[PDB]
Amino acid sequence: TDFLAGIRIVGEDKNGMTNQITGVISKFDTNIRTIVLNAKDGIFTCNLMIFVKNTDKLTTLMDKLRKVQGVFTVERL
Amino acid sequence: TDFLAGIRIVGEDKNGMTNQITGVISKFDTNIRTIVLNAKDGIFTCNLMIFVKNTDKLTTLMDKLRKVQGVFTVERLSN
């Protein structure tokens, strides 16, 4: 019942942004499949592919990511 | 001051390893610039670009990653 889901995060690259984002994703109950993260010229972008048990897990993770300082948007791909 | 360095990690895609490696990287005391991680064919590869203090510091981060059971290789990237 687990399925592959994608999430895109965009924000400003300030105050250890990347460490916080990677910390949240790694600690969460999900199986990371792919990460394409770049932080240059003050902007942060990250496309994540993960295996999730259900939609509740996916939306919960997206909600946590939105609370990280500097994040503009978190959208499902 | 800090300079840009690259690190490549290759390991087994089992037992929560991708999450484990991402966690180790997040706990690093450095400025992460790029992460390209992909899990496929039973393994995962991860190219990381970070701004680091000096070579001694870089070596300590690579040693931390190499000590994670399940990691096959950790090498410094050039270019």
Per-residue HEC secondary structure of chain B comes to CCEEEEEEEEEECCCCHHHHHHHHHHHCCCEEEEEEEEEECCEEEEEEEEEECCHHHHHHHHHHHHCCCCEEEEEEECC
Q: What's the angle, vertex CA A28, arms to CA B11 and CA B8, rounded to 5?
A: 25
Please tell me the experimental approach by which this structure was elucidated. Answer: X-ray
Whole-number Å distance between alpha carbons of A62 and A14? 20
Q: What's the angle, vertex CA B20, arms to CA B2 and CA A33, rounded to 5?
A: 100
A22 at B interface, C-beta within 8 A: yes
The amino acid sitting at B52 is V
Whole-number Å distance between alpha carbons of A17 and B13? 26
Question: Can you read off the two tokens belonging to residue B27?
Answer: 């706990």
Domain limits, chain A: 1-77
Q: Which CATH number fits domain B1-79: 3.30.70.20, 3.30.460.10, 3.30.70.260, 3.40.462.10?
A: 3.30.70.260
DSSP reduced 3-state for A60: helix
Whole-number Å distance between alpha carbons of A3 and A72? 26
Nearest to A19 among B16, B18, B32 (CB): B32
Whole-number Å distance between alpha carbons of B75 and B63? 10
B38 at A interface, C-beta within 8 A: yes
The H-assigned helical ranges of A1-77 are 17-27, 55-66
A36 at B interface, C-beta within 8 A: yes
CB contact under 8 A, A36 and B36: yes
Do B35 and B48 meet the contact criterion of CB atoms below 8 Å apart? yes
Q: What count of other Cβ atoms lies within 10 Å of the Cβ of residue B11? A: 23
Task: State the residue for tokens 């997040």.
Answer: B26
B35 at A interface, C-beta within 8 A: yes
Name B39's Cβ contacts closer than 8 Å, sequence gap at least 6: A32, A33, A34, B13, B18
The amino acid sitting at A70 is G
Question: Can you read off the two tokens belonging to residue A12?
Answer: 């400003």
The amino acid sitting at A33 is R
CB contact under 8 A, B16 and A31: yes
Task: Record the resolution, in angstroms.
Answer: 1.9
Helical axes B17-27 vs A17-27, angle rounded to 10°: 150
Q: Which long-range contacts (CB under 8 A, 24 or more apart) does B46-50 make?
A: B46/A35, B46/B8, B46/B9, B46/B10, B46/B21, B47/B6, B47/B7, B47/B8, B47/B77, B48/B6, B48/B7, B48/B8, B48/B9, B49/B4, B49/B5, B49/B6, B49/B77, B50/B4, B50/B5, B50/B6, B50/B7
- Which chain B residue lies closest to A42 (C-alpha atoms)? B33
- Superfamily name with CATH number, domain A1-77: ACT domain (3.30.70.260)
